[PDB]
Design a protein around this ligand. Structure first.
Ligand code: AGS
Lengths: 686, 58, 58, 58
């Protein structure tokens, strides 16, 4: 009762509690559960970070603010302290001495004491049973979802007693209301101020992006860490101050370099150095005087902050204990005076604070957050519509070629992100025709790098890849409860780095019509019920589907001829082989073509850019002619694959002889190479 | 660090200000440096401590 | 529901407690001449005390 | 073949970026015995590529 148990009358009466905000449903459920004659040990399903201990702090604000009903009034509620129960144990076995003494006095107390176990899942297990089962006490609990699911269901009398209550993490505007209710302690504890759009943007964007952490927990990380950043850097001296401080300490050390002399007439020049020293000392003295002026505003507002929190605690305790003249004394009297000259103090910081910035805005949140995450802040400064209309420019920074692909696929992405398809679809409902190696993976890297911000983002699917029906069981790994907790899912790996994906669904026509129906469930509904039966949201997934039907006529119809011809007579083949439902699914039909003549020269010189940099490190610079690279081209242009024996004929035709000629000693480094024009086998000449 | 028996922590200021911003927090106060080791976790602690003893610490 | 008090006595009780906590603030008055207006609040306040006596007697 | 890496058990990769994977194949023996000589080489590329399309990926 006394030495190892503590009455919550005097802990809620002392007020060790943070303020609470509108916690209606869970607390009223706690009341009706606690009025049951048995199983009145309610257990709150949730984790700390939603504020379950703070919900108990608010039920203690409804005891100490008197807001509890007629059932739970008059009860004298004493809390156990195991951290107090460890006191006085030296020889082995005195903690449970004092613990079963707690069973002695809470045994004689006989119902007077409701127990609260801070961290219920501390409460062993065979000995917590007979006292509750006989009825010797009255308690309340709380634990984790997974801990609860491994807690109640098995044992007989344990699922007789411990009880389920739905307590959850709120939506946007309610966490906004919690941060509004806690900016009392935030502002008046952290030497900061808080406005409403910082709370709204904190709870809103923190609600949206991070589906991991808790609300308002991560916003408490923002206001706590960032508010102490504002307090800490306000404590620092300003920037022109320490610029001038470095300049005056360098000028004083140089003056000490000037005073110690041997030749007098050469070293007595320091007069101008002395008057510059006087001027810079005057300017630094005035600026640090301005710093102390802002510290004078913070001195007056500091003591009025102290007397301010004492004043509102005074009016609230005046509401609590009830002295008659003190209530009206504070109400009309002391506290609105401190409100008015509190407004004069906000104008005092509103006119004194030039260098140091007392008010917290979103930009310091962008400081603490921009040094939290590391994703570029321009991507948040980007909007969707601007990077939809200016997509062709940055797509023409990295990638050369594919004009109707960038323009028409850009029309499909402007329609898709604009919402001009069914919103029950994935992002990009495409159909690509053409050979391999023209830049499909490079297109996934370019779009992934622009809107997804990664050189690492692509997984690709040809239909002969297909890891099977057993493979969905392979990414769930073992069923839960078997060996393999060391890895489990490699879903955690390939989806650790990339939650989204850009997928290159190769040869959609060569697959089965069951993949027209599974992939019809891909293009429809924005989600696919997979081989296991569950479904994952493809609406955050661009479904790029590529193919290789008409290779040769596409490799011809590239130079000079319009490409809408190739698209439409391609659709003359697409209409026959598909249902018209697939034509209804995709927006337009894009066919990739192997590039034109000067752009084939761009392909070969880009494949030789590795040779420019590999060789410009070692000390070789090629100035390859268009005719030597042209013999690379037409000695590479095999109409079988496209540009794929073009690398084979560049590296095999010149570079293996160029490795013999460079590595044999024929090509001396430090000299400019021009790949000249001999017979058809190409020999480099110095 | 007072005898001068150690080595300075040079450059890398986003990491040192990162840990200090983790320090100054009230609720969730204490830091943990986390990574696959060899990036200088105790050496980043030496970034904190050298920033403290040099007197240039906020 | 048996063990507690109904809704209308809670509404009337809160408005009467609010008006008498306004009365504690309005007894210590600054200007006695310009603040004569609360006489209707005194008469209606006495009416709320009579209705409070009836409802609490019930 | 795409990477020169191999995502092995714990989640790391295996360093294949500077070594060579080699495979002796027991398929195109009698096909090569049919192309040489008097039969066209791209015909054996064709139908040997066909049985590869029965047994491999391109
Ligand atoms: N960024 C870095 N700055 C300084 N030293 C570094 C850095 N990265 C690696 N090192 C070196 O690698 C060692 C690892 O850093 P540590 O200071 O030991 O941090 P640590 O990971 O906590 O190691 P402990 O103390 O054994 S847990 C250092 O002692 C240096 O030799």
């Amino acid at each position: 009762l006394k030495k190892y148990t503590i009455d919550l009358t005097e802990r809620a009466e002392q007020g060790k509690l943070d303020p609470v905000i509108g916690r209606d449903e869970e607390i009223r459920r706690t009341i009706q559960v606690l009025q049951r004659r048995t199983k009145n040990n309610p257990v709150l399903i949730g984790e700390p970070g939603v504020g379950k201990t703070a919900i108990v702090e608010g039920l203690a604000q409804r005891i100490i603010n008197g807001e509890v009903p007629e059932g739970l009034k008059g009860r004298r509620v004493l809390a156990l302290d195991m951290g107090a129960l460890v006191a006085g144990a030296k020889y082995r076995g005195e903690f449970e001495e004092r613990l079963k003494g707690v069973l002695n006095d809470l045994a004689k107390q006989e119902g007077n004491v409701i127990l609260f176990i801070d961290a219920l899942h501390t409460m062993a297990g065979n000995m917590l049973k007979p006292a509750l089962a006989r009825g010797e006490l009255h308690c309340v609990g709380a634990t984790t979802l997974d801990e609860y699911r491994q807690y109640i269901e098995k044992d007989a009398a344990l699922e007789r007693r411990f009880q389920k209550v739905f307590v959850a993490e709120p939506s946007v505007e309610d966490t906004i209301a919690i941060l509004r209710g806690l900016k009392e302690r935030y502002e008046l504890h952290h030497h900061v101020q808080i406005t409403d759009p910082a709370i709204v943007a904190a709870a809103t964007l923190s609600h949206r992006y991070i589906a991991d952490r808790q609300l308002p927990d991560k916003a408490i990380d923002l206001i706590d860490e960032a508010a102490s950043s504002i307090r800490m850097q306000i404590d620092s001296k300003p920037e022109e101050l320490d610029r001038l401080d470095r300049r005056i300490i360098q000028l004083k050390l140089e003056q000490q370099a000037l005073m110690k002399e041997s030749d007098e007439a050469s070293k007595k020049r320091l007069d101008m150095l002395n008057e510059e020293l006087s001027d810079k000392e005057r300017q630094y003295s005035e600026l640090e005087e301005e710093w102390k002026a802002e510290k004078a505003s913070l001195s007056g507002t500091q003591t009025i902050k102290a007397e301010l929190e004492q004043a509102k605690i005074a009016i609230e305790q005046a509401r609590r204990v009830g002295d008659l003249a003190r209530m009206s004394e504070l109400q009309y009297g002391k506290i609105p005076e401190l409100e008015k000259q509190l407004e004069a103090a906000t104008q005092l910081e509103g006119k004194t604070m030039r260098l140091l910035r007392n008010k917290v805005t979103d930009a310091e949140i962008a400081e603490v957050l921009a040094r939290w995450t590391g994703i570029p802040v321009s991507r948040m400064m980007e909007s969707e519509r601007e990077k939809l209309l200016r997509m062709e420019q940055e797509l023409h920074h990295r990638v050369i070629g594919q004009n109707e692909a960038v323009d028409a696929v850009s029309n499909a992405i402007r329609r898709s992100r604009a919402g001009l398809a069914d919103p029950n679809r994935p992002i990009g409902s495409f159909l690509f025709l053409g050979p391999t190696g023209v830049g499909k993976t490079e297109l996934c890297k370019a779009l992934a790098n622009f809107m997804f911000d990664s050189d690492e983002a692509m997984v690709r699917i040809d239909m002969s890849e297909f890891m099977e029906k057993h493979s969905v069981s392979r990414l769930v790994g073992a069923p839960p409860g078997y060996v393999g907790y060391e890895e489990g899912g490699y879903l955690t790996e390939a989806v650790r780095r990339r939650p989204y994906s850009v997928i290159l669904l190769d040869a959609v026509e060569k697959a089965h019509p069951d993949v027209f129906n599974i992939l019809l469930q891909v293009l429809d509904d924005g989600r696919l019920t997979d081989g296991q039966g569950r479904t994952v949201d493809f609406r955050n997934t661009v479904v790029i589907m590529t193919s290789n039907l008409g290779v040769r006529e596409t490799e011809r119809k590239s130079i000079g001829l319009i490409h809408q011809d190739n698209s439409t007579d391609a659709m003359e083949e697409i209409k026959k082989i598909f249902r018209p439902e697939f034509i209804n699914r995709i927006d337009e039909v894009v066919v990739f073509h192997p590039l034109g003549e000067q752009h084939i020269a761009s392909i070969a010189q880009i494949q030789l850019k590795r040779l420019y940099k590999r060789l410009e490190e070692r000390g070789y610079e090629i100035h390859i002619s268009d005719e030597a690279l042209k013999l690379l081209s037409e000695n590479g242009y095999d109409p079988v694959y496209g540009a794929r024996p073009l690398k084979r004929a560049i590296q095999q035709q010149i570079e293996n002889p160029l490795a013999q000629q460079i590595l044999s000693g024929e090509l001396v480094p430090g000299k400019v190479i021009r790949l000249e024009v001999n017979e058809d086998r190409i020999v480099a000449v110095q």
